[PDB]
Design a protein around this ligand. Structure first.
Ligand SMILES: *[C@@H]1O[C@H](CO)[C@@H](O[C@@H]2O[C@H](CO)[C@@H](O)[C@H](O)[C@H]2NC(C)=O)[C@H](O)[C@H]1NC(C)=O
Lengths: 50, 50
């Protein structure tokens, strides 16, 4: 006879994007003023995810 | 800058109005009358008012 069987292979995943300064310091201005003197920390995270 | 897709600054919907609520017709605490009481307790039997 002829048997049949199925097989899944994963080729992709969900594309997660992250706003760094909205995650860390959501809406408060004193938080953004303190975060601005960390330099290039959020840009590197955004670049790695892109 | 080059051609590309840029994820720009995070925006929040700005708040239009304010909703301020309190309880009307409350008595006065009068902490100044308790502080200006005549009898003053010692540190051995200090006094507390809630
Ligand atoms: C200052 O504190 C004394 C606590 O010794 C108050 O005396 C009390 O007064 C109330 C009514 O005024 C009485 O019901 C209590 O019995 C009193 N306490 C005692 C231990 O007798 C006094 O009233 C306070 N002063 C003011 C202006 O409130």
């Amino acid at each position: 006879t002829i048997a049949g069987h199925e097989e899944f292979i994963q080729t992709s995943s969900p594309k997660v994007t992250i706003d760094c300064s909205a995650f860390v310091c959501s809406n408060y201005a004193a938080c953004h003023d303190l975060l601005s003197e960390y330099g290039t920390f959020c840009d590197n995270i955004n670049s790695i995810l892109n | 800058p080059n051609t590309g897709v840029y994820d720009l600054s995070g925006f929040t919907v700005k708040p239009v109005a304010t909703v301020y609520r309190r309880i009307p017709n409350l008595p006065d605490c009068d902490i100044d009358n308790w502080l200006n009481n005549v009898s003053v307790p010692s540190p051995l039997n200090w006094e507390r008012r809630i």
